[PDB]
């Protein structure tokens, strides 16, 4: 019983820092991710270019292997350390059994490390929640999410960061059965998610794709302008 | 116990006999007077197998 420390329970059976460390994620930048049937795609919002510096270093979407893709929320330093560890874990797994690394094993690694990191004596838990997207077994699209407690939790679409309830609520009203594939409709689905974002500034949108066989492709802020134009065309056709 | 707890035994034994209400005091009246004055009820019990 108190917000210190991590080790003792509440008198009604809670952990304060486990519950409180998710708030740092919940005040963090928004990053969504869906799975198609063949091409999986995701993206972050709030690029927030401050007019005088470069932004190629602030990239919140990366990869550990050619088959898996990353995202996170919360603070950036824990994401840096966890991904730098996870690359070496992926490569050590590759040094073992010669398969491409399954998404399930590396999510069990990351959440397990995060949890046994939390259980120890006075280590501040990683206030992040990762998005781990891959299509490995005959191109079966999978995306799991993490938690500061360290619970991998398999979804079909995902939304975190600021206002994640509303952004996930849009996918409730959007995600019918016949999404994909239909890759173009998955493209427009990512575009409608970016239009349903908390700010949807139009130029602060950064999205990355994976066709389950190719590499990670960073798009261009003219294709997305065409996507916003055809989405506004669909809104006018609704009228 | 103190003297007042024995007094509580005595009086609660009287009215436990008066739950029956018929006759004078019995030994079980004193027993149930004790069984009220005794606890402090625990009955907790757990982890001690």
């Amino acid at each position: 019983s108190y917000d210190r420390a991590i080790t003792v329970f509440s008198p009604d059976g809670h952990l304060f820092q486990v519950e409180y460390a998710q708030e740092a994620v919940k005040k963090g930048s928004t990053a969504v991710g869906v799975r198609g049937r063949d091409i999986v795609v995701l993206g972050v919002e709030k690029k927030s270019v401050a007019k005088l510096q470069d932004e190629r270093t602030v990239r919140k979407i990366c990869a550990l292997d050619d088959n898996v893709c990353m995202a996170f929320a919360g603070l950036t330093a824990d994401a840096r350390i966890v991904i730098n560890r996870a690359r070496v874990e992926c490569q050590s797994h590759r040094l073992t059994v010669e398969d491409p690394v399954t998404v399930e094993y590396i999510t069990r690694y990351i959440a397990s490390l995060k949890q046994r990191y939390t259980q120890s004596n006075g280590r501040r838990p990683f206030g992040i929640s990762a998005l781990i997207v891959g299509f490995d077994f005959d191109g079966t699209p999978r995306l799991y999410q993490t938690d500061p407690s360290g619970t991998y939790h398999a979804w079909k679409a995902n939304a975190i960061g600021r206002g994640a309830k509303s952004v996930r609520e849009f996918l409730e009203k959007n995600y019918t059965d016949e999404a994909i594939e239909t890759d173009d409709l998955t493209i427009k689905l990512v575009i409608k998610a970016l239009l349903e974002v908390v700010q949807s500034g139009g130029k602060n949108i950064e999205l990355a794709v994976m066709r389950r066989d190719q590499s990670l492709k960073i798009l261009n802020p003219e294709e997305i302008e065409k996507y916003v134009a055809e989405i506004e065309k669909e809104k006018e056709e609704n009228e | 116990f103190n003297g007042a707890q024995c007094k509580a035994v005595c009086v609660e034994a009287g009215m436990i006999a008066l739950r029956r209400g018929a006759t004078e005091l019995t030994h079980e009246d004193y027993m149930e007077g004790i069984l009220e004055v005794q606890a402090k009820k625990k009955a907790n019990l757990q982890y001690y197998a």
Binding site: - | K42, Y48, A49
Partner: protein, 238 residues
């Protein structure tokens, strides 16, 4: 009251209240009674349950071919000291190829439990051991404490409301020494039936009896050699 928190801190009256709190934690265990004859040592405990469908938690557990223990208090420390007990048995069984005298074993138990009562970082062990054994000089009934002041007796009883059991031992410690096994065991449960409230009766499923003899190996029983021991009784004098 700010000094009543830790094991290391002496009280301004000199009484470590952590020890007495460990004693009170021991007092919330099950009832059990240990008593010996000149030739046979019998310890009898009481079982309890979580629910009606649930099983009964065992108390008497096996240790060695001539050593068996009762227990009251914590269960993790109980199995911890069980593992240590079995280890201390089989180590000298391996080295010296003899069964142990009981006294040096229980001194090892006290020296084991001293360090978690003096340094900081480990709590004292809530423990209720009653140990029956056979060295060259016959049966021994030892009892323990969280203060590691192990006591040798002829008849003891620890747990909840064990005082009536102690008075029964007072009024039959002259009688325990000469009798054979059967009425000795029914003296033991004529302590356990006073460790209960009188509005219920000691059943089969709630009791276990362990006999070790000078020629008899330590054996635990449950309902089946106990239904023979449960006959031969009268009712309580209501």
């Amino acid at each position: 009251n700010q000094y009543d928190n830790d094991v290391t801190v002496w009280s301004p009256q000199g009484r470590i209240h952590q020890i007495e709190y460990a004693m009170e934690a021991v007092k919330q265990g099950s009832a059990t009674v240990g008593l010996k004859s000149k030739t046979h040592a019998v310890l009898v405990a009481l079982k309890r349950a979580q629910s009606e469908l649930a099983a009964h938690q065992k108390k008497i557990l096996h240790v060695d071919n001539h050593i068996g223990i009762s227990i009251a208090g914590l269960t993790a420390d109980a199995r911890l000291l069980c593992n240590f007990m079995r280890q201390e048995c089989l180590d000298s069984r391996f080295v010296f190829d003899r069964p142990l005298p009981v006294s040096r074993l229980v001194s090892l138990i006290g020296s084991k439990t001293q360090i978690p009562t003096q340094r900081y970082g480990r709590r004292p062990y809530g423990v209720g051991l009653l140990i029956a054994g056979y060295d060259d000089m016959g049966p021994h009934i030892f009892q323990t404490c969280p203060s590691a002041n192990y006591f040798d007796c002829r008849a003891m009883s620890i747990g909840a409301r064990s005082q009536s059991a102690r008075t029964y031992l007072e009024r039959h410690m002259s009688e325990f020494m000469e009798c054979n096994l059967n009425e000795l065991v029914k003296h033991g449960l004529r302590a356990l039936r006073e460790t209960l409230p009188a509005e219920q009766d000691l059943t089969t499923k709630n009791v276990s009896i362990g006999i070790v003899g000078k020629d008899l190996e330590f054996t635990i029983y449950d309902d089946d050699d106990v239904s023979p021991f449960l006959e031969g009784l009268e009712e309580r004098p209501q």
